[PDB]
Amino acid sequence: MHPRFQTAFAQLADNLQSALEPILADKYFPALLTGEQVSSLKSATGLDEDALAFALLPLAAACARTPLSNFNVGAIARGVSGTWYFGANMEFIGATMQQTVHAEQSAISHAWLSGEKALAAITVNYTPCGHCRQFMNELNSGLDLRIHLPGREAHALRDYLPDAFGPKDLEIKTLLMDEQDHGYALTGDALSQAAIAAANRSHMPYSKSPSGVALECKDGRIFSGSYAENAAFNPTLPPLQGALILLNLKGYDYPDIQRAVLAEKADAPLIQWDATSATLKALGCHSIDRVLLA
Amino acid sequence: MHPRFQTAFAQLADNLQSALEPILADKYFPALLTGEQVSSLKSATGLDEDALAFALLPLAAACARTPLSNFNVGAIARGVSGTWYFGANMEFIGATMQQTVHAEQSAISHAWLSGEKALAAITVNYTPCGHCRQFMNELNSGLDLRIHLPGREAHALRDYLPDAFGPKDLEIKTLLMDEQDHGYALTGDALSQAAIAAANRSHMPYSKSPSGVALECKDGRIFSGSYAENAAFNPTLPPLQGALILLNLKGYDYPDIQRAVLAEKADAPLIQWDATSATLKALGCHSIDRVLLA
Numbered sequence: 001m002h003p004r005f006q007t008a009f010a011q012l013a014d015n016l017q018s019a020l021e022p023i024l025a026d027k028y029f030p031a032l033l034t035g036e037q038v039s040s041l042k043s044a045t046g047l048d049e050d051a052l053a054f055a056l057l058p059l060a061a062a063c064a065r066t067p068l069s070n071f072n073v074g075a076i077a078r079g080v081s082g083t084w085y086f087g088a089n090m091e092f093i094g095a096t097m098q099q100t101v102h103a104e105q106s107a108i109s110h111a112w113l114s115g116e117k118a119l120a121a122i123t124v125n126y127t128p129c130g131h132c133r134q135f136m137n138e139l140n141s142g143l144d145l146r147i148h149l150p151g152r153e154a155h156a157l158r159d160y161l162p163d164a165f166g167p168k169d170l171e172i173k174t175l176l177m178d179e180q181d182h183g184y185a186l187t188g189d190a191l192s193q194a195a196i197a198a199a200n201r202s203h204m205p206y207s208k209s210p211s212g213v214a215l216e217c218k219d220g221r222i223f224s225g226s227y228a229e230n231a232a233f234n235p236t237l238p239p240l241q242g243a244l245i246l247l248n249l250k251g252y253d254y255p256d257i258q259r260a261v262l263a264e265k266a267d268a269p270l271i272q273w274d275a276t277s278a279t280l281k282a283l284g285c286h287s288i289d290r291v292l293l294a
Numbered sequence: 295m296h297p298r299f300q301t302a303f304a305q306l307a308d309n310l311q312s313a314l315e316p317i318l319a320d321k322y323f324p325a326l327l328t329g330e331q332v333s334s335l336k337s338a339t340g341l342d343e344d345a346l347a348f349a350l351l352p353l354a355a356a357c358a359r360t361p362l363s364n365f366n367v368g369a370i371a372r373g374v375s376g377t378w379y380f381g382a383n384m385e386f387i388g389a390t391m392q393q394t395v396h397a398e399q400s401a402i403s404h405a406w407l408s409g410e411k412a413l414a415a416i417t418v419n420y421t422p423c424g425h426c427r428q429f430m431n432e433l434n435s436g437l438d439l440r441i442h443l444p445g446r447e448a449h450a451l452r453d454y455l456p457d458a459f460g461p462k463d464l465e466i467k468t469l470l471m472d473e474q475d476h477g478y479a480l481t482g483d484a485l486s487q488a489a490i491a492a493a494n495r496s497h498m499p500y501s502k503s504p505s506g507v508a509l510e511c512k513d514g515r516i517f518s519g520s521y522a523e524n525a526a527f528n529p530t531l532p533p534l535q536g537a538l539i540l541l542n543l544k545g546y547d548y549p550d551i552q553r554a555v556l557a558e559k560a561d562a563p564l565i566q567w568d569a570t571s572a573t574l575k576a577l578g579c580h581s582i583d584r585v586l587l588a
């Protein structure tokens with residue numbers, strides 16, 4: 001078991017620990033649960049989904065990286081597919097506040113990047129900040145998304161975001177998690193191609209600047225991230241962040257990072273290049289390349 | 295009159311135009327109104343504050359810079375001092391979504407930077423995004439801040455941000471707009487000293503990384519910006535943005551920018567350097583220096 005979970009695990013109910021023991025066994029437990037797994041857990045404990053989800057929060061929170069806040073936040077996105085994805089906040093020393101990732105954004109991207117077509121709900125161990133409520137309203141699930149918090153009745157997003165601002169406000173018809181393929185040809189080595197394919201799924205109706213980032217680990221494993229714009233602009237998820245989310249959730253660490261590539265247009269109104277490099281260097285990765293879309 | 299206002303102005307009621315004619319006369323009308331001015335306006339039109347504020351929105355919106363969205367948003371912060379500050383969104387081509395500024399952040403910083411001790415209300419021509427609701431909850435006015443939108447009853451922030459996340463959540467006691475002075479000694483030329491003094495007023499209880507940016511225009515005018523952190527991290531206002539807000543609001547343009555300086559600690563957990571330079575270069579400013587706090 002991945003040391004991160006150690007303590008959390010020790011804190012679970014016996015019947016839960018038992019059901020989990022085998023799953024968390026693998027150090028590379030992918031911070032996610034399939035329907036089947038979920039079902040199994042429900043049988044072993046008497047928990048319902050909602051209560052189960054809350055019960056797991058602490059494992060999700062155990063994946064947090066909070067050098068600054070020391071405030072660990074865990075979230076669980078529930079796929080319409082039945083799969084449940086963990087998510088946790090990340091803070092990067094040597095960068096800026098704008099590079100931070102919220103437990104909520106983590107889980108949702110985890111899901112999205114993983115191929116999830118839509119979410120049904122999200123559970124968080126702490127009420128969501130406004131930035132995250134806004135982020136959520138970009139999804140194809142809209143204001144209907146249900147949100148579960150400890151010691152609270154559940155609610156739809158619309159409740160947490162009254163008189164909401166969103167894509168419609170900008171006359172945008174395609175939502176995040178909707179299907180997209182920008183059609184760029186894949187080229188170069190593996191890393192580049194991963195980066196480009198990531199750009200191909202990017203959500204960028206506002207600026208129209210597709211981008212993607214792919215990271216290669218020491219063991220040759222690869223994590224890639226897609227750009228996701230947001231109607232309110234700022235809460236947009238940069239492509240780098242996507243990759244780092246996967247990387248951390250999947251059990252790796254910064255130092256495991258070998259080289260990275262960023263793909264984007266050269267003539268785009270917005271440019272990820274600087275922020276990607278800077279942050280990566282901050283994390284200690286020095287090999288970064290950029291590939292130009294067309 | 296500053297060409298930007300041209301059309302807006304043409305759209306105002308006659309008695310309003312009249313009262314304004316003289317104020318807006320100056321090309322460098324500072325996008326702000328003192329109590330006296332306000333009073334005057336009320337007398338000339340029969341408007342009450344709330345209605346007056348709405349009536350002016352279009353001038354505030356006229357200060358917007360929206361190369362991307364083409365979506366002009368105006369806001370008016372009302373000082374407890376009686377002064378009213380304009381605010382408008384800004385989008386920067388060649389940068390990233392995270393560098394964007396919301397009409398709301400503009401007005402509030404305008405006020406804060408100007409020396410305002412606290413706000414009583416804010417009026418916006420469009421419902422606020424979640425990022426801005428969160429930004430607002432960092433202020434010393436808390437959830438009480440009143441928010442006025444067109445065709446809506448007014449409300450407190452708490453209404454737009456139910457079950458809010460904020461500074462208290464992190465056990466923070468000093469709010470934005472509260473009084474602060476970090477006490478760094480001022481040194482170097484004027485520009486540096488402006489930058490450092492800006493850092494001295496910075497709000498950064500979370501990361502403890504004070505920073506400030508000062509810009510020098512062709513005419514030798516100087517605009518400076520203070521760093522303002524936010525409990526939810528991301529909605530934090532970088533120091534550069536502060537300066538650019540002032541610069542644009544006060545009637546200048548990017549090209550008027552001569553040289554810039556950024557002051558910050560070298561050993562700070564967060565670092566503004568990269569983003570500042572990058573964005574400034576994007577705006578076409580090549581002279582940037584950094585000064586190290588101590």
Ligand SMILES: O=C1NCC=CN1[C@@H]1O[C@H](CO)[C@@H](O)[C@H]1O
Pocket residue numbers: 066069071073088089090091100101102103104126127128129132459525526527
């Ligand atoms: O992830 C969440 N969710 C609820 C509220 C805040 N945060 C995060 O919690 C820390 C405190 O802001 C930062 O890492 C930030 O991203």
Ligand SMILES: O=C1NCC=CN1[C@@H]1O[C@H](CO)[C@@H](O)[C@H]1O
Pocket residue numbers: 165231232233360363365367382383384385394395396397398420421422423426
């Ligand atoms: O300034 C505001 N206030 C209300 C909602 C959005 N925005 C802004 O409006 C444009 C559309 O998101 C961007 O410039 C963004 O900063």
Ligand SMILES: [Zn+2]
Pocket residue numbers: 102103104128129130131132133526
């Ligand atoms: Zn959040």
Ligand SMILES: [Zn+2]
Pocket residue numbers: 232396397398422423424425426427
């Ligand atoms: Zn906003």
